[PDB]
Design a protein around this nucleic acid. Structure first.
Lengths: 64, 65
DNA sequence: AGGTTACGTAACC
DNA sequence: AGGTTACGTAACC
Protein backbone atom coordinates (compact mmCIF):
# COMPACT_ATOMS: atom_id res chain seq x y z
CA UNK A 1 0.00 0.00 0.00
CA UNK A 2 1.27 3.53 -0.82
CA UNK A 3 2.86 5.51 2.00
CA UNK A 4 1.01 8.35 3.71
CA UNK A 5 3.09 10.77 1.63
CA UNK A 6 2.34 9.09 -1.72
CA UNK A 7 -1.35 8.94 -0.80
CA UNK A 8 -1.28 12.69 -0.09
CA UNK A 9 0.53 13.35 -3.35
CA UNK A 10 -2.00 11.33 -5.38
CA UNK A 11 -4.86 13.37 -3.82
CA UNK A 12 -3.08 16.67 -4.59
CA UNK A 13 -2.12 15.60 -8.12
CA UNK A 14 -5.76 14.65 -8.78
CA UNK A 15 -7.09 17.86 -7.23
CA UNK A 16 -4.84 19.82 -9.63
CA UNK A 17 -5.57 17.63 -12.66
CA UNK A 18 -9.31 17.86 -12.01
CA UNK A 19 -9.07 21.66 -11.90
CA UNK A 20 -7.14 21.81 -15.19
CA UNK A 21 -9.84 19.73 -16.93
CA UNK A 22 -12.54 22.09 -15.62
CA UNK A 23 -10.61 25.18 -16.72
CA UNK A 24 -10.07 23.66 -20.16
CA UNK A 25 -13.76 22.74 -20.50
CA UNK A 26 -14.88 26.26 -19.64
CA UNK A 27 -12.20 27.65 -22.00
CA UNK A 28 -13.57 25.52 -24.87
CA UNK A 29 -17.17 26.53 -24.14
CA UNK A 30 -16.16 30.18 -24.41
CA UNK A 31 -14.08 29.50 -27.55
CA UNK A 32 -17.08 28.04 -29.41
CA UNK A 33 -19.25 31.02 -28.46
CA UNK A 34 -16.46 33.45 -29.40
CA UNK A 35 -15.49 31.65 -32.64
CA UNK A 36 -19.19 31.63 -33.60
CA UNK A 37 -19.57 35.40 -33.18
CA UNK A 38 -16.20 35.74 -34.95
CA UNK A 39 -17.41 33.60 -37.85
CA UNK A 40 -20.77 35.37 -38.17
CA UNK A 41 -18.98 38.76 -38.39
CA UNK A 42 -16.11 37.95 -40.78
CA UNK A 43 -18.60 36.24 -43.09
CA UNK A 44 -20.79 39.37 -43.03
CA UNK A 45 -17.74 41.44 -43.98
CA UNK A 46 -17.09 39.03 -46.85
CA UNK A 47 -20.66 39.59 -48.12
CA UNK A 48 -20.05 43.35 -48.15
CA UNK A 49 -16.62 42.97 -49.78
CA UNK A 50 -17.80 40.58 -52.52
CA UNK A 51 -20.67 42.96 -53.31
CA UNK A 52 -18.07 45.75 -53.30
CA UNK A 53 -15.94 43.76 -55.77
CA UNK A 54 -18.96 42.96 -57.97
CA UNK A 55 -19.61 46.74 -57.97
CA UNK A 56 -16.09 47.74 -59.06
CA UNK A 57 -15.95 44.94 -61.65
CA UNK A 58 -19.02 46.23 -63.49
CA UNK A 59 -17.91 49.85 -63.01
CA UNK A 60 -14.65 48.96 -64.80
CA UNK A 61 -16.58 46.93 -67.39
CA UNK A 62 -18.55 50.09 -68.21
CA UNK A 63 -15.83 52.79 -68.12
CA UNK A 64 -13.43 50.66 -70.19
CA UNK B 1 -22.81 0.38 9.75
CA UNK B 2 -24.19 3.30 7.67
CA UNK B 3 -22.53 1.54 4.70
CA UNK B 4 -24.55 1.44 1.43
CA UNK B 5 -25.84 -1.97 0.36
CA UNK B 6 -24.02 -4.04 -2.26
CA UNK B 7 -26.77 -3.10 -4.75
CA UNK B 8 -26.41 0.61 -3.96
CA UNK B 9 -22.62 0.40 -4.32
CA UNK B 10 -23.20 -1.17 -7.74
CA UNK B 11 -25.64 1.59 -8.71
CA UNK B 12 -23.27 4.38 -7.66
CA UNK B 13 -20.59 2.78 -9.84
CA UNK B 14 -22.96 2.41 -12.81
CA UNK B 15 -24.31 5.94 -12.43
CA UNK B 16 -20.79 7.38 -12.18
CA UNK B 17 -19.64 5.41 -15.21
CA UNK B 18 -22.59 6.75 -17.24
CA UNK B 19 -22.02 10.31 -15.97
CA UNK B 20 -18.33 10.08 -16.93
CA UNK B 21 -19.27 8.78 -20.40
CA UNK B 22 -21.66 11.70 -21.05
CA UNK B 23 -19.04 14.19 -19.83
CA UNK B 24 -16.37 12.71 -22.13
CA UNK B 25 -18.72 12.53 -25.14
CA UNK B 26 -19.32 16.26 -24.70
CA UNK B 27 -15.58 16.89 -24.38
CA UNK B 28 -14.75 15.15 -27.69
CA UNK B 29 -17.62 16.99 -29.43
CA UNK B 30 -16.43 20.41 -28.21
CA UNK B 31 -12.85 19.61 -29.16
CA UNK B 32 -14.04 18.69 -32.64
CA UNK B 33 -16.28 21.73 -32.94
CA UNK B 34 -13.54 24.12 -31.79
CA UNK B 35 -11.25 22.68 -34.48
CA UNK B 36 -13.95 23.00 -37.14
CA UNK B 37 -14.57 26.57 -35.98
CA UNK B 38 -10.89 27.53 -35.80
CA UNK B 39 -10.20 26.27 -39.34
CA UNK B 40 -13.32 28.04 -40.60
CA UNK B 41 -12.11 31.29 -38.97
CA UNK B 42 -8.73 30.86 -40.64
CA UNK B 43 -10.49 30.11 -43.94
CA UNK B 44 -12.93 33.05 -44.03
CA UNK B 45 -10.09 35.33 -42.84
CA UNK B 46 -7.84 34.35 -45.75
CA UNK B 47 -10.81 35.08 -48.04
CA UNK B 48 -11.31 38.48 -46.37
CA UNK B 49 -7.63 39.18 -47.08
CA UNK B 50 -8.06 38.13 -50.72
CA UNK B 51 -11.09 40.41 -51.11
CA UNK B 52 -9.17 43.33 -49.58
CA UNK B 53 -6.47 42.88 -52.23
CA UNK B 54 -9.02 42.37 -55.01
CA UNK B 55 -10.62 45.64 -53.87
CA UNK B 56 -7.31 47.52 -54.30
CA UNK B 57 -6.27 45.89 -57.60
CA UNK B 58 -9.61 46.97 -59.11
CA UNK B 59 -9.37 50.48 -57.61
CA UNK B 60 -5.94 51.02 -59.20
CA UNK B 61 -7.26 49.70 -62.52
CA UNK B 62 -10.28 52.04 -62.32
CA UNK B 63 -8.08 55.02 -61.38
CA UNK B 64 -5.91 55.07 -64.52
CA UNK B 65 -8.62 54.46 -67.17
C1' DA C 1 8.60 12.54 -10.33
C1' DG C 2 3.93 13.18 -10.34
C1' DG C 3 0.82 13.99 -14.25
C1' DT C 4 -2.40 10.92 -16.34
C1' DT C 5 -5.42 7.04 -17.06
C1' DA C 6 -9.07 4.71 -14.99
C1' DC C 7 -12.59 3.47 -11.89
C1' DG C 8 -14.78 3.93 -7.10
C1' DT C 9 -17.34 5.81 -2.94
C1' DA C 10 -21.11 8.01 -0.86
C1' DA C 11 -23.64 12.03 0.45
C1' DC C 12 -26.62 15.29 -1.59
C1' DC C 13 -30.79 16.94 -3.89
C1' DA D 1 -34.48 7.31 -7.75
C1' DG D 2 -30.28 7.90 -9.37
C1' DG D 3 -28.07 11.85 -11.55
C1' DT D 4 -24.90 15.02 -9.68
C1' DT D 5 -21.53 17.00 -6.58
C1' DA D 6 -17.27 16.22 -4.52
C1' DC D 7 -12.92 13.70 -3.59
C1' DG D 8 -10.20 9.71 -3.27
C1' DT D 9 -7.31 5.59 -4.71
C1' DA D 10 -3.42 3.61 -7.07
C1' DA D 11 -1.24 1.75 -11.08
C1' DC D 12 0.72 3.26 -15.20
C1' DC D 13 4.13 5.77 -17.94
Amino acid sequence: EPSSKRKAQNRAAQRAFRKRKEDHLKALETQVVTLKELHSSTTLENDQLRQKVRQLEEELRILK
